[PDB]
Amino acid sequence: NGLVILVSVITSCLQTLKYCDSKLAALELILHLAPRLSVEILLDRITPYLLHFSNDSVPRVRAEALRTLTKVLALVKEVPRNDINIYPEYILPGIAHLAQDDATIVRLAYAENIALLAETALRFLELVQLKNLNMEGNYDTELQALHEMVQQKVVTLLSDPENIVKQTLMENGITRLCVFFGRQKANDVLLSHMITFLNDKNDWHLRGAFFDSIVGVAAYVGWQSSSILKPLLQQGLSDAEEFVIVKALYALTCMCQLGLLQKPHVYEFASDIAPFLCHPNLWIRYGAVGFITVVARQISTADVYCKLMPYLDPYITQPIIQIERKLVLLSVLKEPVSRSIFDYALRSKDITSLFRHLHMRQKKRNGSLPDCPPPEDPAIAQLLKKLLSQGMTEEEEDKLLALKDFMMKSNKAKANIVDQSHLHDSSQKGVIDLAALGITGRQVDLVTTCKTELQQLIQQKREQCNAERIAKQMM
Amino acid sequence: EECTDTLLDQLDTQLNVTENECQNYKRCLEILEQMNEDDSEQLQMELKELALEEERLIQELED
Amino acid sequence: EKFHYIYSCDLDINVQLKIGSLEGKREQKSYKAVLEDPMLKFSGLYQETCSDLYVTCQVFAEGKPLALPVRTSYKAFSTRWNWNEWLKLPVKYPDLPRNAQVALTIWDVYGPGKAVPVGGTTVSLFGKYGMFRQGMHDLKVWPNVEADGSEPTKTPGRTSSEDQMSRLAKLTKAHRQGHMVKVDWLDRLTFREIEMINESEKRSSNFMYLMVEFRCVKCDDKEYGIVYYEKDGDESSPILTSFELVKVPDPQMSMENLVESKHHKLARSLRSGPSDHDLKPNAATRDQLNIIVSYPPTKQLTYEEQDLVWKFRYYLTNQEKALTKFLKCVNWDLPQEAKQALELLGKWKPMDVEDSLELLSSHYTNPTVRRYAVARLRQADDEDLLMYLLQLVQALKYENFDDIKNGLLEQDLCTFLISRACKNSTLANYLYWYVIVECEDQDTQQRDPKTHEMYLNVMRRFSQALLKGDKSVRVMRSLLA
Amino acid sequence: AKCVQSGDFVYFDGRDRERFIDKKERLSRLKSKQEEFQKEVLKAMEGKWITDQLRWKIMSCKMRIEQLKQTICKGNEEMEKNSEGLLKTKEKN
């Protein structure tokens, strides 16, 4: 039990630590002892010093102080008589500045942990309620104060100037934080914030992260989310970055498995996704197989043949039923559009008239028109010549025409990003400069642990300089 | 007043859609009745011949 | 001739890494495994010579990920896995510790919904002596495993060596950079030898490599190496080499007791502001509070009592004497409590002049509680303030001397004494002698000259306040002279 | 709220004369036929479903014969190469 005596020699140092290494060491020490220390020692003694480090001058330490505080507080299985208020009155207001910290790593470390602080505080209030009942606070107005206090922070992180913080909140716990918003406000303020991430037309990782996490929030909001979210999923399938499409297809897969897509929209999405079964990108191709097999498993086998097969038969080799098994459908997919043919079509300046010409050739191919003239604008004939001379088979023309809507929308969106490429024209190059930020350079003539390492580096550079200088002169 | 007119249209469209789906099932039945002509015996026997071949190739694999 | 560098803590910009190409044959599994699990047939390994791989780039440290894994945007491949994408990593150079690592996993498709790793490579962002990776690097990709960022890394992308090509490639790059002495006749032979060695390694082994590149930060045509460094790592500890009075140094000597500070905020919660108008102490706490209010003016309350005097501060408001205790519970450093104390002070049934003398004593220095004392000391006869005047002239020692020297809740204590003196000549008589004793006190003139000069300015003020009085008052100035 | 309970409401524009209750009844009847058509389709499905299982079995087996034939080719070419290597190594030895 002597740990209480040891913790006193540790804690007596935590206010005078100068170096970052010792401050970080002190946080490991606390975390290593914390499971052994009694609840009273964690909240009364240890906690005041964890909050102290959250104000430290080193951002790594502020980050690790919150990261330790969350893990330490998660250990408190009981509530001291005098600490029932620690979360509303001491912990949360004491770290609330981190959620708006200057250093990204701190806000980032806040986003990674707020999903757990909130849940710990809620479970703490739960224990307080059980304590009051077993002993015999206005739970309703305390819980709502915790919610209003959590919601204010979530909305702050979703409004962070650096997308990585939003993206980090998405992956770490937005599905659980929804409880702090409740069924209604999760839609009004939380979901409406996430829907805004798809307006970022230059950070595809944020649009990706939207589709990764949106399934959780949509499942929570329930039926209300379908009509609001439906058009955003169709945009995702038409995105400018194909990995966002893969993530959009994955979202629709998971949403169909949860029964969140209303029955008419399920078939509607299958009509839009079936063309992807011949897309050259295997990630999209098997993404479509994912979604469309999930559909075949959610719907009745009567609808599989009567409603799903008509959308799928143009890309299937044989109209096999029991496509509900992913192995079956992969085995019967037609060969995809070769990536070369796909790029020449998609990348063309005016893809509209290209498809119009190809669509007219389809009519001539299927007997629905008598004969077809050559294209009118030579740029279309030049493209037609390129495509056909590159081995474009007639089946690839039919498949390209099925991908018509995707390629058209996607090409239009890719262009719209190029219309923003002027804003980042400087970063695309291989070089970045200090001149913009005015950072003071440091130099040494070649003719603490950090300070010693730098001396060793300088010594190595003087030696490696003389080595090349001498050898060159000697030759 | 406006809600009444709107709800009447929502039912009229629901009716027309549900009716169309019923016509779709009918059309599918008109196709399934023709697919019933497919023989099961010849197909199943082809599986037996292929299963015999696999038994040969799997033994040769062990060898 | 010069080495240019910057500290990793000064460069507050996002780290950026180019995912280059992936070189090397990819081991195809024998069809025996394809028979074990048929979904292998649809993996990217079997469908196309180059699959549309992607590279994840998590920055690890101490075996923990520093941030979310950035990833290469989709690029189609036909005959060469080549990305030319600068991943803007999610961490900045000051966020990186000395053991920061990039964990570059290469991924491929494995049927629907499931990626599988082609291989992984982990390279520390800081070299042998803390300099950040300066340029192009070829990292050995450990096959079929996800890149591990634990320390030590089980899938290191680099070696300290221990094989021919890892040494010969470093020398080849050094030779290309011009670091190595050029000799055309040797080079034309040694590189054929290295070609034979590499082509042998490419056959006898199936290792693959991932090219990566780090941005060479530039300024005014100089390229700065980034050196791992820490703000405050620049100062050596000022440990004193000898001691003879303080044998047992204590690092928490004059630091704030954070545990006590934590107990303040919880026990004396202001959020009860709306509840405390309704909720009031019950039978068992009434007796207890009455006992506390009865305490002598010198009995410093224990934290249990100070707690109870705050929890029901809105109840005690109805008692004149209880205000003497409340003003001792309030911490006068904390602007939070002070802003509520000065509020409830203005709501409290006011204390009597007996109690008002307490607020003037040394312990109280917040101007609004000193001025409030005067705001009740005013409500007493000049007959009484004539007797207390001997003490009150000493309470000026506890008064803000800056308001005196420039005074040449309406009134501070000195202004109130001078005011009430002009209003009644009996006070003005004694007020002259009391203050002039201090001005003649040659001990104060040497032991605490600041207090001595305060009385001198009190006398200059009184000298002037009489001259600014009525004709009948001005005569008192000449009478005292 | 009194309108929906009466069932007497119709378009104010006079676009139609059949009451909402008449249309709701017709929808229930259409849904009834939807059940009938699905139950009629499913009895046809129970036939095709069996033959398509067989078709998938044949196609799976053919995909496995293609695999095994290649596996034997691979195994033979590896063995042939190893035999030629062994012979050369014995000669060298």
PDB file of all heavy atoms in Angstrom, chain A residues 214-236:
ATOM      1  N   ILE A 214     -20.239   8.111 -41.754  1.00  0.00           N
ATOM      2  CA  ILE A 214     -21.637   8.503 -41.905  1.00  0.00           C
ATOM      3  C   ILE A 214     -22.601   7.356 -41.637  1.00  0.00           C
ATOM      4  O   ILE A 214     -23.748   7.590 -41.241  1.00  0.00           O
ATOM      5  CB  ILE A 214     -21.859   9.083 -43.312  1.00  0.00           C
ATOM      6  CG1 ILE A 214     -23.227   9.731 -43.402  1.00  0.00           C
ATOM      7  CG2 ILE A 214     -21.753   8.000 -44.355  1.00  0.00           C
ATOM      8  CD1 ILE A 214     -23.379  10.860 -42.457  1.00  0.00           C
ATOM      9  N   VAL A 215     -22.177   6.110 -41.843  1.00  0.00           N
ATOM     10  CA  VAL A 215     -23.075   4.986 -41.591  1.00  0.00           C
ATOM     11  C   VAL A 215     -23.478   4.934 -40.124  1.00  0.00           C
ATOM     12  O   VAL A 215     -24.619   4.597 -39.789  1.00  0.00           O
ATOM     13  CB  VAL A 215     -22.422   3.671 -42.042  1.00  0.00           C
ATOM     14  CG1 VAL A 215     -23.366   2.516 -41.808  1.00  0.00           C
ATOM     15  CG2 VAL A 215     -22.031   3.759 -43.494  1.00  0.00           C
ATOM     16  N   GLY A 216     -22.549   5.268 -39.229  1.00  0.00           N
ATOM     17  CA  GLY A 216     -22.867   5.283 -37.809  1.00  0.00           C
ATOM     18  C   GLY A 216     -23.886   6.345 -37.446  1.00  0.00           C
ATOM     19  O   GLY A 216     -24.877   6.072 -36.765  1.00  0.00           O
ATOM     20  N   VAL A 217     -23.651   7.573 -37.899  1.00  0.00           N
ATOM     21  CA  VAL A 217     -24.560   8.676 -37.622  1.00  0.00           C
ATOM     22  C   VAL A 217     -25.917   8.446 -38.270  1.00  0.00           C
ATOM     23  O   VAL A 217     -26.959   8.723 -37.667  1.00  0.00           O
ATOM     24  CB  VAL A 217     -23.932   9.993 -38.090  1.00  0.00           C
ATOM     25  CG1 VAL A 217     -24.839  11.145 -37.758  1.00  0.00           C
ATOM     26  CG2 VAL A 217     -22.590  10.166 -37.446  1.00  0.00           C
ATOM     27  N   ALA A 218     -25.934   7.933 -39.500  1.00  0.00           N
ATOM     28  CA  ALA A 218     -27.202   7.662 -40.168  1.00  0.00           C
ATOM     29  C   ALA A 218     -27.993   6.583 -39.448  1.00  0.00           C
ATOM     30  O   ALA A 218     -29.217   6.688 -39.325  1.00  0.00           O
ATOM     31  CB  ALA A 218     -26.955   7.261 -41.618  1.00  0.00           C
ATOM     32  N   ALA A 219     -27.325   5.532 -38.983  1.00  0.00           N
ATOM     33  CA  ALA A 219     -28.027   4.500 -38.231  1.00  0.00           C
ATOM     34  C   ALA A 219     -28.640   5.079 -36.965  1.00  0.00           C
ATOM     35  O   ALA A 219     -29.723   4.662 -36.540  1.00  0.00           O
ATOM     36  CB  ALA A 219     -27.077   3.354 -37.893  1.00  0.00           C
ATOM     37  N   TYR A 220     -27.960   6.048 -36.355  1.00  0.00           N
ATOM     38  CA  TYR A 220     -28.468   6.681 -35.144  1.00  0.00           C
ATOM     39  C   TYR A 220     -29.657   7.587 -35.437  1.00  0.00           C
ATOM     40  O   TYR A 220     -30.689   7.507 -34.764  1.00  0.00           O
ATOM     41  CB  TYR A 220     -27.348   7.472 -34.477  1.00  0.00           C
ATOM     42  CG  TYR A 220     -27.726   8.075 -33.155  1.00  0.00           C
ATOM     43  CD1 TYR A 220     -27.828   7.291 -32.021  1.00  0.00           C
ATOM     44  CD2 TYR A 220     -27.983   9.428 -33.040  1.00  0.00           C
ATOM     45  CE1 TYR A 220     -28.149   7.839 -30.809  1.00  0.00           C
ATOM     46  CE2 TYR A 220     -28.322   9.982 -31.834  1.00  0.00           C
ATOM     47  CZ  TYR A 220     -28.400   9.184 -30.720  1.00  0.00           C
ATOM     48  OH  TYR A 220     -28.760   9.734 -29.516  1.00  0.00           O
ATOM     49  N   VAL A 221     -29.536   8.449 -36.447  1.00  0.00           N
ATOM     50  CA  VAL A 221     -30.636   9.337 -36.807  1.00  0.00           C
ATOM     51  C   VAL A 221     -31.814   8.541 -37.350  1.00  0.00           C
ATOM     52  O   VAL A 221     -32.971   8.952 -37.209  1.00  0.00           O
ATOM     53  CB  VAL A 221     -30.140  10.397 -37.806  1.00  0.00           C
ATOM     54  CG1 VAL A 221     -31.295  11.180 -38.383  1.00  0.00           C
ATOM     55  CG2 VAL A 221     -29.159  11.323 -37.133  1.00  0.00           C
ATOM     56  N   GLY A 222     -31.551   7.379 -37.935  1.00  0.00           N
ATOM     57  CA  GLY A 222     -32.602   6.530 -38.456  1.00  0.00           C
ATOM     58  C   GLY A 222     -33.266   7.040 -39.725  1.00  0.00           C
ATOM     59  O   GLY A 222     -32.658   7.707 -40.563  1.00  0.00           O
ATOM     60  N   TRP A 223     -34.548   6.697 -39.859  1.00  0.00           N
ATOM     61  CA  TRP A 223     -35.335   7.016 -41.048  1.00  0.00           C
ATOM     62  C   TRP A 223     -35.220   8.464 -41.512  1.00  0.00           C
ATOM     63  O   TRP A 223     -35.263   8.724 -42.719  1.00  0.00           O
ATOM     64  CB  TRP A 223     -36.798   6.686 -40.763  1.00  0.00           C
ATOM     65  CG  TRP A 223     -37.279   5.443 -41.422  1.00  0.00           C
ATOM     66  CD1 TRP A 223     -36.637   4.241 -41.473  1.00  0.00           C
ATOM     67  CD2 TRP A 223     -38.542   5.251 -42.066  1.00  0.00           C
ATOM     68  NE1 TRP A 223     -37.405   3.322 -42.145  1.00  0.00           N
ATOM     69  CE2 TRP A 223     -38.583   3.916 -42.515  1.00  0.00           C
ATOM     70  CE3 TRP A 223     -39.636   6.082 -42.321  1.00  0.00           C
ATOM     71  CZ2 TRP A 223     -39.674   3.395 -43.204  1.00  0.00           C
ATOM     72  CZ3 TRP A 223     -40.718   5.564 -43.004  1.00  0.00           C
ATOM     73  CH2 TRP A 223     -40.729   4.233 -43.438  1.00  0.00           C
ATOM     74  N   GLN A 224     -35.094   9.419 -40.589  1.00  0.00           N
ATOM     75  CA  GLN A 224     -34.989  10.816 -41.003  1.00  0.00           C
ATOM     76  C   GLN A 224     -33.795  11.072 -41.914  1.00  0.00           C
ATOM     77  O   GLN A 224     -33.853  11.950 -42.781  1.00  0.00           O
ATOM     78  CB  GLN A 224     -34.866  11.704 -39.769  1.00  0.00           C
ATOM     79  CG  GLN A 224     -35.956  11.524 -38.742  1.00  0.00           C
ATOM     80  CD  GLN A 224     -35.802  12.480 -37.579  1.00  0.00           C
ATOM     81  OE1 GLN A 224     -34.818  13.212 -37.492  1.00  0.00           O
ATOM     82  NE2 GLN A 224     -36.769  12.469 -36.671  1.00  0.00           N
ATOM     83  N   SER A 225     -32.711  10.318 -41.735  1.00  0.00           N
ATOM     84  CA  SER A 225     -31.481  10.559 -42.482  1.00  0.00           C
ATOM     85  C   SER A 225     -31.552  10.135 -43.942  1.00  0.00           C
ATOM     86  O   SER A 225     -30.733  10.597 -44.741  1.00  0.00           O
ATOM     87  CB  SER A 225     -30.303   9.854 -41.814  1.00  0.00           C
ATOM     88  OG  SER A 225     -30.465   8.451 -41.838  1.00  0.00           O
ATOM     89  N   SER A 226     -32.477   9.252 -44.309  1.00  0.00           N
ATOM     90  CA  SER A 226     -32.461   8.700 -45.660  1.00  0.00           C
ATOM     91  C   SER A 226     -32.609   9.768 -46.739  1.00  0.00           C
ATOM     92  O   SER A 226     -31.775   9.860 -47.644  1.00  0.00           O
ATOM     93  CB  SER A 226     -33.562   7.651 -45.802  1.00  0.00           C
ATOM     94  OG  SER A 226     -33.429   6.942 -47.020  1.00  0.00           O
ATOM     95  N   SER A 227     -33.648  10.597 -46.659  1.00  0.00           N
ATOM     96  CA  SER A 227     -33.862  11.584 -47.716  1.00  0.00           C
ATOM     97  C   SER A 227     -32.802  12.680 -47.760  1.00  0.00           C
ATOM     98  O   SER A 227     -32.518  13.213 -48.838  1.00  0.00           O
ATOM     99  CB  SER A 227     -35.246  12.208 -47.560  1.00  0.00           C
ATOM    100  OG  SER A 227     -35.437  12.699 -46.245  1.00  0.00           O
ATOM    101  N   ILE A 228     -32.205  13.032 -46.624  1.00  0.00           N
ATOM    102  CA  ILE A 228     -31.136  14.029 -46.626  1.00  0.00           C
ATOM    103  C   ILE A 228     -29.840  13.449 -47.175  1.00  0.00           C
ATOM    104  O   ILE A 228     -29.128  14.102 -47.944  1.00  0.00           O
ATOM    105  CB  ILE A 228     -30.948  14.645 -45.228  1.00  0.00           C
ATOM    106  CG1 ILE A 228     -29.736  15.576 -45.219  1.00  0.00           C
ATOM    107  CG2 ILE A 228     -30.816  13.585 -44.171  1.00  0.00           C
ATOM    108  CD1 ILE A 228     -29.658  16.460 -44.003  1.00  0.00           C
ATOM    109  N   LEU A 229     -29.526  12.213 -46.809  1.00  0.00           N
ATOM    110  CA  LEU A 229     -28.255  11.589 -47.147  1.00  0.00           C
ATOM    111  C   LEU A 229     -28.250  10.953 -48.529  1.00  0.00           C
ATOM    112  O   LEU A 229     -27.189  10.877 -49.156  1.00  0.00           O
ATOM    113  CB  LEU A 229     -27.915  10.553 -46.076  1.00  0.00           C
ATOM    114  CG  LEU A 229     -26.596   9.805 -46.117  1.00  0.00           C
ATOM    115  CD1 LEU A 229     -25.452  10.795 -46.062  1.00  0.00           C
ATOM    116  CD2 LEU A 229     -26.541   8.864 -44.937  1.00  0.00           C
ATOM    117  N   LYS A 230     -29.402  10.476 -49.005  1.00  0.00           N
ATOM    118  CA  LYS A 230     -29.541   9.875 -50.336  1.00  0.00           C
ATOM    119  C   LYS A 230     -28.818  10.635 -51.444  1.00  0.00           C
ATOM    120  O   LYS A 230     -28.039  10.005 -52.170  1.00  0.00           O
ATOM    121  CB  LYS A 230     -31.046   9.740 -50.615  1.00  0.00           C
ATOM    122  CG  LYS A 230     -31.464   9.535 -52.053  1.00  0.00           C
ATOM    123  CD  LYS A 230     -30.868   8.304 -52.675  1.00  0.00           C
ATOM    124  CE  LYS A 230     -31.690   7.894 -53.876  1.00  0.00           C
ATOM    125  NZ  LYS A 230     -31.774   9.005 -54.856  1.00  0.00           N
ATOM    126  N   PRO A 231     -29.022  11.941 -51.649  1.00  0.00           N
ATOM    127  CA  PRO A 231     -28.297  12.618 -52.736  1.00  0.00           C
ATOM    128  C   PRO A 231     -26.798  12.711 -52.512  1.00  0.00           C
ATOM    129  O   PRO A 231     -26.049  12.796 -53.492  1.00  0.00           O
ATOM    130  CB  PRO A 231     -28.938  14.011 -52.784  1.00  0.00           C
ATOM    131  CG  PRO A 231     -29.524  14.202 -51.465  1.00  0.00           C
ATOM    132  CD  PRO A 231     -29.967  12.859 -50.996  1.00  0.00           C
ATOM    133  N   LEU A 232     -26.330  12.716 -51.264  1.00  0.00           N
ATOM    134  CA  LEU A 232     -24.892  12.797 -51.027  1.00  0.00           C
ATOM    135  C   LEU A 232     -24.185  11.498 -51.379  1.00  0.00           C
ATOM    136  O   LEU A 232     -23.021  11.520 -51.790  1.00  0.00           O
ATOM    137  CB  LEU A 232     -24.606  13.165 -49.571  1.00  0.00           C
ATOM    138  CG  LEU A 232     -24.802  14.615 -49.126  1.00  0.00           C
ATOM    139  CD1 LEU A 232     -24.081  15.563 -50.065  1.00  0.00           C
ATOM    140  CD2 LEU A 232     -26.265  14.981 -49.006  1.00  0.00           C
ATOM    141  N   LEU A 233     -24.861  10.363 -51.223  1.00  0.00           N
ATOM    142  CA  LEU A 233     -24.275   9.085 -51.609  1.00  0.00           C
ATOM    143  C   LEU A 233     -24.126   8.979 -53.120  1.00  0.00           C
ATOM    144  O   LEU A 233     -23.135   8.433 -53.615  1.00  0.00           O
ATOM    145  CB  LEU A 233     -25.105   7.939 -51.049  1.00  0.00           C
ATOM    146  CG  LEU A 233     -25.042   7.913 -49.526  1.00  0.00           C
ATOM    147  CD1 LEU A 233     -26.230   7.181 -48.945  1.00  0.00           C
ATOM    148  CD2 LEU A 233     -23.747   7.291 -49.067  1.00  0.00           C
ATOM    149  N   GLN A 234     -25.103   9.490 -53.869  1.00  0.00           N
ATOM    150  CA  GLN A 234     -25.000   9.493 -55.322  1.00  0.00           C
ATOM    151  C   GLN A 234     -23.865  10.387 -55.795  1.00  0.00           C
ATOM    152  O   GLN A 234     -23.237  10.096 -56.817  1.00  0.00           O
ATOM    153  CB  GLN A 234     -26.315   9.959 -55.931  1.00  0.00           C
ATOM    154  CG  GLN A 234     -27.440   8.971 -55.783  1.00  0.00           C
ATOM    155  CD  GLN A 234     -28.693   9.434 -56.473  1.00  0.00           C
ATOM    156  OE1 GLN A 234     -29.370  10.343 -56.002  1.00  0.00           O
ATOM    157  NE2 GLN A 234     -29.017   8.808 -57.593  1.00  0.00           N
ATOM    158  N   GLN A 235     -23.597  11.477 -55.081  1.00  0.00           N
ATOM    159  CA  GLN A 235     -22.437  12.300 -55.399  1.00  0.00           C
ATOM    160  C   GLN A 235     -21.150  11.529 -55.160  1.00  0.00           C
ATOM    161  O   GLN A 235     -20.206  11.618 -55.950  1.00  0.00           O
ATOM    162  CB  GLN A 235     -22.444  13.569 -54.559  1.00  0.00           C
ATOM    163  CG  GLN A 235     -23.466  14.587 -54.973  1.00  0.00           C
ATOM    164  CD  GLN A 235     -23.157  15.939 -54.394  1.00  0.00           C
ATOM    165  OE1 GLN A 235     -22.195  16.095 -53.644  1.00  0.00           O
ATOM    166  NE2 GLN A 235     -23.962  16.932 -54.744  1.00  0.00           N
ATOM    167  N   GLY A 236     -21.095  10.790 -54.056  1.00  0.00           N
ATOM    168  CA  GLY A 236     -19.922   9.993 -53.744  1.00  0.00           C
ATOM    169  C   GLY A 236     -19.588   8.987 -54.825  1.00  0.00           C
ATOM    170  O   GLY A 236     -18.425   8.815 -55.187  1.00  0.00           O
TER     171      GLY A 236
END
